[PDB]
Amino acid sequence: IFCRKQAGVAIGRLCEKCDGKCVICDSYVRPCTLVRICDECNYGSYQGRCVICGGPGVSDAYYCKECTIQEKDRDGCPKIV
Amino acid sequence: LIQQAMAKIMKANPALYVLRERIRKGLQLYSSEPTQNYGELFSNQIIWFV
Amino acid sequence: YTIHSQLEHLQSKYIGTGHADTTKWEWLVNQHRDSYCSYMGHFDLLNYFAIAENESKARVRFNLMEKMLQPCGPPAD
Amino acid sequence: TGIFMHGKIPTLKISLIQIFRAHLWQKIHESIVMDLCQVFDQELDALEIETVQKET
Amino acid sequence: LLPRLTPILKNRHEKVQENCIDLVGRIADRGAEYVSAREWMRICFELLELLKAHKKAIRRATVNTFGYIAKAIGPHDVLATLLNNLKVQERQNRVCTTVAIAIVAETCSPFTVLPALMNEYRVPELNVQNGVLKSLSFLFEYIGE
Amino acid sequence: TLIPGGSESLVYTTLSGGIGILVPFTSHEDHDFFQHVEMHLRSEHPPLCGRDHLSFRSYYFPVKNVIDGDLCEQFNSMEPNKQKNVSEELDRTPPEVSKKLEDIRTRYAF
Amino acid sequence: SKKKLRRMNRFTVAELKQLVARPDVVEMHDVTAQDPKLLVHLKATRNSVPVPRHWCFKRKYLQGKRGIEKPPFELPDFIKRTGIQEMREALQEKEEQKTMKSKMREKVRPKMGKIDIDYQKLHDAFFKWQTKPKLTIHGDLYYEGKEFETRLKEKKPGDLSDELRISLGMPVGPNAHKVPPPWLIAMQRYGPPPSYPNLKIPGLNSPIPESCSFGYHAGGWGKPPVDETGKPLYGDVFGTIDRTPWGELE
Numbered sequence: 182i183f184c185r186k187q188a189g190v191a192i193g194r195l196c197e198k199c200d201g202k203c204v205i206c207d208s209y210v211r212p213c214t215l216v217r218i219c220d221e222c223n224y225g226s227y228q229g230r231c232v233i234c235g236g237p238g239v240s241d242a243y244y245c246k247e248c249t250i251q252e253k254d255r256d257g258c259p260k261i262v
Numbered sequence: 263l264i265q266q267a268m269a270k271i272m273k274a275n276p277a278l279y280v281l282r283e284r285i286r287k288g289l290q291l292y293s294s295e296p297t298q299n300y301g302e303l304f305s306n307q308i309i310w311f312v
Numbered sequence: 313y314t315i316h317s318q319l320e321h322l323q324s325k326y327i328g329t330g331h332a333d334t335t336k337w338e339w340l341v342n343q344h345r346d347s348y349c350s351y352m353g354h355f356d357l358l359n360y361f362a363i364a365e366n367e368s369k370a371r372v373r374f375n376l377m378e379k380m381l382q383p384c385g386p387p388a389d
Numbered sequence: 390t391g392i393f394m395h396g397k398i399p400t401l402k403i404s405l406i407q408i409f410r411a412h413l414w415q416k417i418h419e420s421i422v423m424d425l426c427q428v429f430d431q432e433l434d435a436l437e438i439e440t441v442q443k444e445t
Numbered sequence: 446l447l448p449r450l451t452p453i454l455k456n457r458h459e460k461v462q463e464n465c466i467d468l469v470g471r472i473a474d475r476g477a478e479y480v481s482a483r484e485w486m487r488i489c490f491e492l493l494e495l496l497k498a499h500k501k502a503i504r505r506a507t508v509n510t511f512g513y514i515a516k517a518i519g520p521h522d523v524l525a526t527l528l529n530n531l532k533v534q535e536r537q538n539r540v541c542t543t544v545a546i547a548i549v550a551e552t553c554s555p556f557t558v559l560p561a562l563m564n565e566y567r568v569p570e571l572n573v574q575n576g577v578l579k580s581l582s583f584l585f586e587y588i589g590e
Numbered sequence: 591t592l593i594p595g596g597s598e599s600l601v602y603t604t605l606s607g608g609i610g611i612l613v614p615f616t617s618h619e620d621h622d623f624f625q626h627v628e629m630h631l632r633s634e635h636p637p638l639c640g641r642d643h644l645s646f647r648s649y650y651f652p653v654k655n656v657i658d659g660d661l662c663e664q665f666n667s668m669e670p671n672k673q674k675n676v677s678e679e680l681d682r683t684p685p686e687v688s689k690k691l692e693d694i695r696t697r698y699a700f
Numbered sequence: 701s702k703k704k705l706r707r708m709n710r711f712t713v714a715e716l717k718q719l720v721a722r723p724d725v726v727e728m729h730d731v732t733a734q735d736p737k738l739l740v741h742l743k744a745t746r747n748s749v750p751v752p753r754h755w756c757f758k759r760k761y762l763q764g765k766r767g768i769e770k771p772p773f774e775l776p777d778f779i780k781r782t783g784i785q786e787m788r789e790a791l792q793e794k795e796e797q798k799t800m801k802s803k804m805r806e807k808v809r810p811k812m813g814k815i816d817i818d819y820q821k822l823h824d825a826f827f828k829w830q831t832k833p834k835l836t837i838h839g840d841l842y843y844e845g846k847e848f849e850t851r852l853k854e855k856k857p858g859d860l861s862d863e864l865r866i867s868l869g870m871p872v873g874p875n876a877h878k879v880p881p882p883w884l885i886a887m888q889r890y891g892p893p894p895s896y897p898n899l900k901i902p903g904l905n906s907p908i909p910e911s912c913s914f915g916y917h918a919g920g921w922g923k924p925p926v927d928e929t930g931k932p933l934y935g936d937v938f939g940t941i942d943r944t945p946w947g948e949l950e
């Protein structure tokens with residue numbers, strides 16, 4: 182399930198369990214570009230969380246270079262709410 | 263050098279292993295052996311700490 | 313199928329997409345509108361038409377945006 | 390093999406034969422000597438060894 | 446120095462491991478000939494089980510040094526030791542050896558490794574046929590053009 | 591062919607006042623050179639207006655066997671830091687690059 | 701009901717084929733389109749590419765490739781002659797013979813550098829003898845059972861095979877020209893077949909194939925069939941720029 186309400190300028194973050202993988206491609210490598218999320222899945226208790234685990238925002242969700250070659254990173258906040 | 267080499271080749275080498283295993287299977291011998299300590303340690307059994 | 317909630321949200325997201333039942337009329341009319349939006353956007357096909365007919369850029373884009381409303385005939389039934 | 394018998398104890402000879410089947414005596418010789426060559430192959434540096442020669 | 450460093454690579458801690466593998470990577474890059482092929486081979490066999498650390502910085506560093514060792518020594522022995530790892534199970538060290546194969550092929554040109562990969566695509570096991578396919582994935586991404 | 595003894599060429603003349611030429615390559619050394627020049631240039635000096643260069647030149651059908659002389663010729667107007675970075679990837683000196691850039695127009699056009 | 705009314709709303713395959721402007725396309729998949737006039741205009745457009753075979757089938761895509769014995773894979777030439785393949789075959793046979801014991805031993809007292817990788821042999825394979833394989837152009841989807849398919853619509857007469865020549869009594873190879881087959885004999889005798897009257901037989905209604913021989917024994921061309929006035933049976937049984945590419949790199 183996806184948020185997909187369109188993108189913004191607020192970076193996303195990763196818990197430490199979820200540390201390292203891309204958001205969709207589920208890679209572990211060659212991350213190129215930073216993730217951005219929507220205000221609605223940006224506010225409040227959802228500030229600085231794990232887009233996947235829900236855990237605390239510590240490490241930065243990133244985008245596997247394949248995902249940027251196919252521009253699957255131009256859709257917005259992909260938060261599994 | 264060879265002291266090391268001997269004391270470890272006697273233990274490690276796979277050829278010697280195939281030997282020892284055919285010996286055992288000819289005898290049909292088996293080991294039933296599987297695999298704080300200080301409750302066992304201060305015993306009348308001497309055990310040294312190095 | 314929550315994928316589908318998102319996917320007919322995608323149909324609601326991108327005017328011009330399709331699904332397995334889509335009709336020749338919706339298909340070709342959507343491609344026709346897109347053709348118009350790009351004749352307007354690209355500063356040079358506008359000169360091509362402006363010059364092909366003897367009209368002028370205001371005339372050209374006014375026609376185009378009028379046509380944008382029922383470009384490919386009246387609807388299907 | 391390199392086993393000497395001093396007679397004929399046929400049961401014992403059968404066991405000992407079935408134990409060293411498939412040229413296992415020479416195979417043991419080869420594995421041991423290979424391992425020794427490898428140890429030298431590694432510690433050439435400390436050993437002042439330019440070359441190690443395994444006579445085929 | 447380096448003989449003293451090798452017993453530190455077993456220190457199972459992210460910061461000391463990071464800096465140690467950095468220093469050994471410098472040395473193996475520049476010193477290369479000073480160390481012996483056999484040393485590099487043993488160190489290959491030890492890297493093969495850093496690919497299970499719980500921290501991802503370690504694993505990326507490990508893959509990089511497989512690359513450097515392929516540059517110093519030739520590629521063929523390190524590639525042989527990587528396929529045999531593909532035979533393992535548990536996925537996250539299979540996937541990181543498949544990255545490493547891609548990296549070796551990128552540095553030392555891909556014709557050296559493509560025949561061995563392709564030929565290994567014939568061993569009838571699943572995890573390994575999928576290892577071959579995923580490695581070609583990364584390779585064309587690394588190779589790009 | 592334009593200038594006397596210059597090798598052959600394709601002149602194309604657009605509908606917006608543009609005029610240009612497509613010019614063959616004689617050596618995989620030239621070819622691979624500019625190939626890498628721009629393959630780095632896209633990555634570290636993208637267009638101003640948001641676009642991607644690969645995708646703009648493959649708008650309708652993908653690119654095939656054409657290098658973007660007008661992206662390559664931008665190395666000049668680049669910045670010393672990046673001029674370095676890229677010409678060092680090429681491990682030639684910014685002199686080597688820029689002269690190999692200019693001369694290829696020299697032997698074909700003006 | 702609604703389904704019954706629109707099913708009756710549907711038409712005959714002859715209805716379609718007569719209506720349509722291009723009748724080659726019509727199939728019952730189209731006759732079952734909820735818009736068959738569209739469906740058929742589309743399928744008759746230029747350059748478009750039809751659905752795969754196998755949406756009807758009950759078997760999945762290549763489960764039909766399953767049952768028959770299948771060979772594994774045959775390398776490219778320029779890699780067989782680059783001596784990394786043979787390297788790999790040799791290492792394979794070695795380690796399949798060695799006993800569990802020896803694999804553990806090679807991991808331990810390793811055979812370090814058994815075979816150094818060979819350069820310029822590789823780099824010349826991949827950069828000097830690499831060559832275009834056989835590719836299939838736009839449209840020709842691969843389906844299962846393709847190998848079976850009979851192959852037809854070569855109404856041409858000259859089409860001969862080598863097993864055909866052997867099991868018909870004629871020659872195979874460079875002599876497939878200078879060999880008039882045993883059917884060109886009665887072509888010369890009473891004519892070529894009257895549905896291939898647009899076929900000329902070589903040595904019987906066509907001229908001598910390259911360096912043919914006139915004569916009446918086994919191995920010749922015999923009497924090129926002609927009238928009593930001299931005109932052959934048909935045809936002639938005896939027999940009486942700057943393509944340089946513009947942009948190129950040598």
Ligand SMILES: [Zn+2]
Binds near residue numbers: 204206208248
């Ligand atoms: Zn991804």
Ligand SMILES: [Zn+2]
Binds near residue numbers: 184185186218259260
């Ligand atoms: Zn959101």
Ligand SMILES: [Zn+2]
Binds near residue numbers: 196199200232233235
């Ligand atoms: Zn998480």
